[PDB]
């Protein structure tokens, strides 16, 4: 990889995009050497990993280099010069006063990821590099910007469009279960994945389901158990080495969107070309055999309306200050920033509350921001029941959700700011009730 040969890539202001083919050692071979070079040069270095899995892998790889691995609170005077942490950890640390450090070189792995923390993190680092405050290395097979759904790969890939079950199925689709070898099947949602997994197990196949909720614990089981099928959301687009020879890819994704002041989860969108390329990129890792990519439909690069962009600006605005040059999203993504930069910045005490809601109460950035903006006492939960009547939340039995406050009054779950992701897709209304009731 020529651009990172020598030391030119380490000069302040240099931004390097490393777009190696999947399976070519980006994370497990190149990145560690990069870090050792920085450590040898005595340069303060930041290494960002997409997930805990990768973070502990990176840890391992840096076996001679003195690093401080951050597995979000706290600060030490121990004095290692390389810090390694997840994308979200970087953002969350910068929400607090004690967490706003500076590094001369920053290396971000899986830098395409469209979780808002990742978007915010690469935006902040890009903005710092544009101000000549650090060097920046973005490592990803699908750099944000132009892209091809069928990029080059180390091994041959047969790509074929076929009808794919929209959940369970009862007859046909025999090619699914006749396949000898292991498959990764991408689904748009946890809900769809549960349906797909149910049929596969009924047909005698072994299945592991991966999503945002299960990935850090169950991804490790894939190597150990070698399931017939990995049924996965887009969470596997971010470094997961699933060790399959076929991908099944409906090319859809859930579509969280703020509509009429609420974040809705209705329907799906066709995936972006980058996303499609990452899904397809689970196979073709080596030469030898010919892998398969079975898909359905076309891509849709226009993801501008998704709530992720707003959430990324919410996060970026609160890890930057009003003073100094204005931050942006990473290059071509700036088009998708929904307001003028700084719009969502909170004062220091509201930001502390904002951070708590995300890190201790599992709130989305969108919901944490609205609560932090509009509430003054962190113990006041009345906003969870003082919303409009169309924000009433159905419980598991389809009835209203009733709960008691500590004083004994009975309330109906009906938030002022309604984020459907808090009651679906890996989050359970029962845990929100724990918050609303003041437990």
CATH number of domain containing 105: 3.40.50.300
Q: Is 254 helix (H, G, I), strand (E, B) or coil?
A: strand
Vertex 271 angle, CA 196 and 229, to 5°: 30
Residues 129 and 39 reside in one and the same domain: yes
- Contact between 270 and 186 under an 8 Å Cβ cutoff? The reply is no
Residues 166 and 287 reside in one and the same domain: yes
Among residues 25, 23, 37, 28, which one has the least CA distance to residue 1?
A: 25
Q: Is 266 helix (H, G, I), strand (E, B) or coil?
A: coil
Tell me how far apart the alpha carbons of residues 236 and 242 are, in angstroms, rounded to a whole number. Answer: 8
Among residues 105, 86, 75, 91, which one has the least CA distance to residue 14?
A: 105
Among residues 111, 121, 178, 104, which one has the least CA distance to residue 143?
A: 111
Whether 26 has a binding-site annotation, put simply, is yes
Tell me how far apart the alpha carbons of residues 278 and 141 are, in angstroms, rounded to a whole number. Answer: 8
Residues 290 and 174 reside in one and the same domain: yes
Please state whether beta strands 183-186 and 246-249 pair in parallel, antiparallel, or not at all (unpaired): parallel
Residues 43 and 121 reside in one and the same domain: yes
User: Which neighbouring-strand residues pair with 84?
Assistant: 47, 69
Residues 125 and 9 reside in one and the same domain: yes
Q: Where are the beta strands (DSSP E) in 273-362?
A: 291-295
Vertex 167 angle, CA 299 and 306, to 5°: 40
Whether 288 has a binding-site annotation, put simply, is no
Domain membership of residue 34 as a residue range: 2-139
- Contact between 331 and 144 under an 8 Å Cβ cutoff? The reply is yes
Whether 23 has a binding-site annotation, put simply, is yes
Tell me how far apart the alpha carbons of residues 299 and 400 are, in angstroms, rounded to a whole number. Answer: 39
Whether 22 has a binding-site annotation, put simply, is yes
Residues 131 and 195 reside in one and the same domain: no
3-state helix, strand, coil split of the chain in percent (to 5) is: 35, 15, 45
Within 13 Å, how many C-alpha atoms sit on residue 21's CB side? 14
Whether 25 has a binding-site annotation, put simply, is yes
Whether 158 has a binding-site annotation, put simply, is no
Q: CA dihedral in degrees (240, 246, 248, 249; nearest 10)?
A: 60
Tell me how far apart the alpha carbons of residues 357 and 370 are, in angstroms, rounded to a whole number. Answer: 11
Tell me how far apart the alpha carbons of residues 210 and 222 are, in angstroms, rounded to a whole number. Answer: 10
Please state whether beta strands 135-139 and 157-161 pair in parallel, antiparallel, or not at all (unpaired): unpaired
Residues 134 and 7 reside in one and the same domain: yes
Residues 118 and 193 reside in one and the same domain: no
The conformation of residue 8, written as its DSSP 8-state character, comes to G
Q: Where are the beta strands (DSSP E) in 8-61?
A: 15-18, 45-49
Sheet-wide strand order for 82-86: 15-18, 135-139, 105-109, 45-49, 82-86, 67-69
Residues 164 and 265 reside in one and the same domain: yes
Residues 77 and 180 reside in one and the same domain: no
Whether 358 has a binding-site annotation, put simply, is no
Residues 102 and 169 reside in one and the same domain: no
The neighbour count for residue 325, using CB atoms within 10 Å, is 12
Whether 76 has a binding-site annotation, put simply, is no
Tell me how far apart the alpha carbons of residues 160 and 303 are, in angstroms, rounded to a whole number. Answer: 25
Residues 194 and 260 reside in one and the same domain: yes
Q: Is 138 helix (H, G, I), strand (E, B) or coil?
A: strand
């Amino acid at each position: 990889p020529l651009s990172v040969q020598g030391t030119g890539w380490m000069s302040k202001g240099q931004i390097t995009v490393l777009d190696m083919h999947p399976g070519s050692g980006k994370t497990h071979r190149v990145l560690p050497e990069l870090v050792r070079q920085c450590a040898d040069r005595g340069m303060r270095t930041l290494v960002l990993a997409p997930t805990r899995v990768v973070l502990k892998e990176m840890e391992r790889a840096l076996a001679g280099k003195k690093v401080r691995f951050h597995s979000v609170e706290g600060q030490t005077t121990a004095g290692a010069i390389v810090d390694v942490m997840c994308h979200a950890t970087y953002v969350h640390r910068r929400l607090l006063p004690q967490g706003r450090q500076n590094w001369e070189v920053a290396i971000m792995d899986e830098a395409h990821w469209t979780d808002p923390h990742s978007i915010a993190a690469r935006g902040h680092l890009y903005s710092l590099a544009k101000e000549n405050r650090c060097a920046l290395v973005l490592m990803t097979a699908t750099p944000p910007g132009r892209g091809d759904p069928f990029p080059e790969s180390n091994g041959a890939i047969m790509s074929e469009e076929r009808a794919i079950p929209d959940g369970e199925w009862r007859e046909g689709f025999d090619w699914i279960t006749e396949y000898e070898g292991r498959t990764a099947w991408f689904v748009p949602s946890i809900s769809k994945g549960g349906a797909v997994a149910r049929t596969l197990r009924q047909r005698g196949k072994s299945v592991i389901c991966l999503n945002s909720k299960t990935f850090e614990k169950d991804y490790l089981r894939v190597r150990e158990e070698k399931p017939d099928f990995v049924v996965t959301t887009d969470i596997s687009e971010m470094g997961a080495n699933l060790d399959v020879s076929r991908v099944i890819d409906g090319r859809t994704n859930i579509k969280p969107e703020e509509v009429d002041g609420k974040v809705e989860l209705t329907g799906t969108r066709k995936v972006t070309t980058a996303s499609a390329a990452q899904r397809r990129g689970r196979v073709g890792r080596t030469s030898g055999r010919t892998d398969e990519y079975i898909y359905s439909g076309q891509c849709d690069d226009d993801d501008t309306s998704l709530v992720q962009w707003k959430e990324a600006q919410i996060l970026l605005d609160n890890i930057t200050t009003l003073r100094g040059p204005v931050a942006t999203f990473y290059g071509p993504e700036q088009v998708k920033m929904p307001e003028v930069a700084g719009h969502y910045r909170l004062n220091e005490e509201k930001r502390k509350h904002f951070r708590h809601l995300m890190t201790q109460c599992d709130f989305t950035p969108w919901l944490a921001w609205h609560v932090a903006t509009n509430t003054s006492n962190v113990l006041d939960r009345s906003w969870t029941w003082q919303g409009p009547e169309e924000n009433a939340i159905d419980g598991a039995d389809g009835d209203l959700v009733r709960f008691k406050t500590p004083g004994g009054s009975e309330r109906v779950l009906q938030p002022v700011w309604k984020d459907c992701r808090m009651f679906r897709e890996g989050r359970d209304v029962k845990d929100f009730i724990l918050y609303a009731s003041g437990r």
